[PDB]
Amino acid sequence: GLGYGSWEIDPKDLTFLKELGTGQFGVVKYGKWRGQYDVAIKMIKEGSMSEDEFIEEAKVMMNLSHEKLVQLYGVCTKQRPIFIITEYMANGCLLNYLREMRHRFQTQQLLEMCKDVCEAMEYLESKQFLHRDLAARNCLVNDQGVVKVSDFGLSRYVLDDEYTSSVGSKFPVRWSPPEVLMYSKFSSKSDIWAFGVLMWEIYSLGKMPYERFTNSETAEHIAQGLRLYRPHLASEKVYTIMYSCWHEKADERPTFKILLSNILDVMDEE
Numbered sequence: 001g002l003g004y005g006s007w008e009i010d011p012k013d014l015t016f017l018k019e020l021g022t023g024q025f026g027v028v029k030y031g032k033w034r035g036q037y038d039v040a041i042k043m044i045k046e047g048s049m050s051e052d053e054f055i056e057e058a059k060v061m062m063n064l065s066h067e068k069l070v071q072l073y074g075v076c077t078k079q080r081p082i083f084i085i086t087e088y089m090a091n092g093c094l095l096n097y098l099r100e101m102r103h104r105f106q107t108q109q110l111l112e113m114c115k116d117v118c119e120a121m122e123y124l125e126s127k128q129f130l131h132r133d134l135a136a137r138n139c140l141v142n143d144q145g146v147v148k149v150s151d152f153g154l155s156r157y158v159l160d161d162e163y164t165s166s167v168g169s170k171f172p173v174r175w176s177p178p179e180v181l182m183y184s185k186f187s188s189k190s191d192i193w194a195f196g197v198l199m200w201e202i203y204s205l206g207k208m209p210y211e212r213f214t215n216s217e218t219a220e221h222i223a224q225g226l227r228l229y230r231p232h233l234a235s236e237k238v239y240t241i242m243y244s245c246w247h248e249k250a251d252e253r254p255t256f257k258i259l260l261s262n263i264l265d266v267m268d269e270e
């Protein structure tokens with residue numbers, strides 16, 4: 001349409017249906033686009049996001065597509081209550097899904113969730129794109145039980161300093177390697193560390209990492225070289241994979257390509 005770039009979606013094409021949940025940019029709703037196509041509508045909360053910066057980045061994000069990566073559809077910009085329009089994921093956030101004991105997951109299903117995420121992450125890594133806040137809260141589950149990685153890179157646009165200061169009350173300390181906590185050194189290997197913690201979350205059925213510790217205590221534990229330990233549902237081989245993400249030296253941590261190989265190996269063996 002006349003006043004629209006390819007990254008831009010006319011909000012008048014949206015039908016709102018129900019609330020899906022919430023998080024750091026506020027509410028996310030389920031809708032239809034042009035009456036027919038399922039979408040999630042992230043209704044970005046006023047003053048929560050560096051919106052011009054994000055909008056520019058969205059243009060780059062439009063070109064990221066992978067089956068295990070939540071698809072960005074476009075953005076509604078002509079309105080500073082902006083909308084981000086994404087792939088609809090009917091089963092919601094992975095963290096809540098893991099915590100519902102009714103599912104009675106087999107460990108084979110849990111390993112597949114790890115592989116889903118790993119595939120998305122290998123893709124992002126092949127594009128030199130850091131997630132920057134990988135965790136179960138940032139993974140979604142579709143109506144087929146497939147896990148996909150969401151909100152990739154969005155922490156760069158969070159205006160709330162509680163989220164972005166490493167000592168900030170809202171920083172993801174529990175998903176952070178020592179070099180992030182100590183000197184804010186983000187890299188592919190910080191994404192690797194978080195993926196390991198994500199595997200732990202999955203095999204722990206959504207327990208909080210370091211659940212008995214405060215953030216400050218967690219940071220001290222980690223800096224001393226101590227680690228999460230083996231969830232009851234992880235085999236020795238699965239435990240080995242997650243633990244490899246937590247090498248004190250960042251350059252000794254695997255890539256997502258190697259981790260994917262390792263996960264496929266275990267799948268063939270177990």
Ligand SMILES: Cc1ccncc1-c1cccc2c(N)c(C(N)=O)nnc12
Pocket residue numbers: 020021022023024025026028040070086087088089090091092093137138139140150151
């Ligand atoms: C993952 C996330 C990050 C930031 N703020 C909200 C969410 C979120 C919470 C619950 C449910 C959903 C959901 N169903 C969809 C979706 N695309 O369907 N997206 N985000 C959700």
